[PDB]
Paper text:
Immature retroviruses are built by the Gag polyprotein; Gag is then cut into domains, and the resulting CA capsid proteins form the mature capsid, which can mediate infection of a new cell. In this study, we have determined the structure of the truncated MLV CA-CTD by X-ray crystallography and have resolved the architecture and CA lattice structures of immature and mature MLV particles by cryo-ET and subtomogram averaging.
No structure of the MLV CA C-terminal domain (CA-CTD) has been determined to date, and the detailed protein interactions in the immature and mature CA lattice of MLV are not known. The structure of the truncated MLV CA-CTD was determined at 1.89-Å resolution by single-wavelength anomalous diffraction (SAD). The dimerization interface includes helix 9, as previously shown for other retroviruses. A short helical turn was found in the MLV CA-CTD between helices 10 and 11 (red) that is not conserved between genera and that contributes to the dimerization interface. We compared the arrangement of the monomers in our mature lattice model with the monomer arrangements in the crystal structures of the CA-NTD hexamer and the CA-CTD dimer (present study), respectively. The structures were essentially identical, indicating that the oligomeric forms present in the crystal structures are representative of the arrangement in the mature virus.
Author numbering:
A (entry chain A), B (entry chain B): 1 to 87
Write the structure that this text describes.
Amino acid sequence: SPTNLAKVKGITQGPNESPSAFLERLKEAYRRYTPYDPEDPGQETNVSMSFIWQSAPDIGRKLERLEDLKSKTLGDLVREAEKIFNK
Amino acid sequence: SPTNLAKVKGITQGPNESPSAFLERLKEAYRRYTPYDPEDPGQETNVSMSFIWQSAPDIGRKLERLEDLKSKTLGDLVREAEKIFNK
Ligand SMILES: [Co+2]
């Protein structure tokens, strides 16, 4: 599909949706509606920021407060979100 | 300031504001409210996405449609935005 950033911003984690399932849906939107490959090392911070911003609000607020946030990989962020999601 | 992604999302080009002045404010928000340095080359596609998304909608829609958008530098996007802004 032709580039449409709104489609990427429109991927929001559902109330029952696991962080890893949400991340896969977010990556699919990057693939379909941007020229950026969400698996590229150069895109990690970009996907990470969308992941944090568009996670369910309780999760997003906690991910944003992680210590040494800059050091967190996309995999780290998913694991931290899962801790909040699973309790 | 402590990380606060809403402040980055809240930087939007003003109705009469030049693209270059808007990008300066967007970079300032990245510096103040994220751990991501907007002058780090590793962050350029991240700042570029925010710039397209948060530009005035007429400009952002045109930037989305640039041929070979993936190869545009942040400096390229600003120049093309300035070309649109100045008629
Ligand atoms: Co496509």
